Amino acid sequence: AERTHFMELALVEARSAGERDEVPIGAVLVLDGRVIARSGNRTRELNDVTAHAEIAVIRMACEALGQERLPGADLYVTLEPCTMCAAAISFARIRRLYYGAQDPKGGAVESGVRFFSQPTCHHAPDVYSG
Amino acid sequence: RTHFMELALVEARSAGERDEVPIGAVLVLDGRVIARSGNRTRELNDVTAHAEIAVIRMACEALGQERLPGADLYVTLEPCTMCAAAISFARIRRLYYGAQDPKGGAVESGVRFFSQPTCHHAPDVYSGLAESESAEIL
Ligand SMILES: [Zn+2]
Ligand SMILES: [Zn+2]
């Protein structure tokens, strides 16, 4: 239940991302109480608009585990996920989503399209913000 | 457009044969196809590997740029919520797609992303291209 530690790692990733001129957002993917993936935004570095921290750790964890989805895993992010990441989180079958502040300009969990509450969303995680 | 959809359909049928969701897409720039792909989520253990994102990633690698301004994307099925957002981020100029997806779509269906305040860039949308074939192959 080391949530403070999980968020700290995400904050570290966020700071590092900012230093390399990326959007300062970080995330960690946890499975069975252990961090199995960590990352900040890498869209500039990879010339990939989908390389947001959330998707980066989802791809990394899936590669480490050799599975197409992450049922039972928890995702910690420094900022409310956007529309693209919210949908990816749903597709990955993430169990719990923990994030810091809301992002009114582009969020999609409690802000914006509130994807997890829409009829076109077929899977939603637990959501703990702030 | 006929050639672009022809190729997208080729990718869609191939994806189905690979036990992937039978969806295909092509990325066009200056009237030429610069990327083509079907779904690869199962092959790559990557739920983001939808045809749309695959071609955006490939085209960006081929051009060495983060965004694809002026590019058009053709896909056999209406983009989902994740892809609609990626399409926005990539600054795609025009989006052409075949069949509608009322179950998981996000363009004309569902959240109708391009009409939302949290979307900061919308492509011009054209639907119904080769709808029968696209829908026929799921
Ligand atoms: Zn995102
Ligand atoms: Zn999609």
User: Where are chain A's structural domains?
Assistant: 1-130
Q: How far is B49 from chain A (nearest CA, A)?
A: 10
Q: Assign residue B76 a region (left: φ > 0; alpha: ψ between -120 and 50; beta: otherwise).
A: alpha
Q: Which residues in A75-94 are b (16+ Cβ under 10 Å) and which e?
A: bbbbbbbbbbbbbbbbbbbb
Environment class of B63 (CB within 10 Å of its CB; exposed 0-12, middle 13-18, buried 19+): middle
> What residues pair up with B75 in beta bridges, in sequence order?
B25, B97
Calpha distance A80→A103 (Å, rounded): 6
> Domain A1-130 sits in which CATH superfamily?
Cytidine Deaminase, domain 2 (3.40.140.10)
Q: Residue A110 is which amino acid?
A: E
Ligand nearest to the CA of B39: 2
| Ligand whose nearest atom lies closest to the CA of A85 | 1
Spatial separation of the C-alpha atoms in residues B113 and B61, rounded to whole Å: 26
Tell me the C-alpha distance between B76 and B98, whole Å.
5
- CB distance B113–A83 less than 8 Å? yes
- Which experimental technique did the depositors report for determining this structure? X-ray
Backbone angles phi, psi at A120, to 5 degrees: -80, 0
Q: Pairing relation of β-strands B124-127 and B32-38?
A: unpaired
Torsion of CA B10, B12, B15, B21, to 10 degrees: -170
- Please judge whether A50 and B57 are an interchain contact, meaning their C-beta atoms are less than 8 angstroms apart: yes
Q: Compute the distance between CA of residue B56 and CA of residue B84 in angstroms, rounded to an integer.
A: 12
Give residues 99 to 118 of B whose Cβ lies within 8 Å of A: 103-106, 109-111, 113, 116-118
CB contact under 8 A, B106 and A86: no
Q: Where are the beta strands (DSSP E) in chain B?
A: 24-29, 32-38, 72-77, 94-99, 124-127
Q: How far separated are the first and last CA of chain B, in Å rounded? A: 21
Residue in A62, A86, A49 with CA at minimum distance from that of residue B52: A49
Cα gap A42→B66, rounded to integer Å: 11
Interface of B with A in 39-58 (CB under 8 A): 41-42, 45-48, 53, 56-57
Question: Could you give the 3-state DSSP secondary structure of residue B27?
Answer: strand
CATH pick for B1-138 out of 2.40.30.10, 3.40.140.10, 3.40.250.10, 3.30.565.10: 3.40.140.10
B41 to chain A: closest CA residue: A68
What number of other Cβ atoms are within 10 A of residue A52's Cβ?
29
Question: What tokens appear for B44 in the block?
Answer: 């790559």
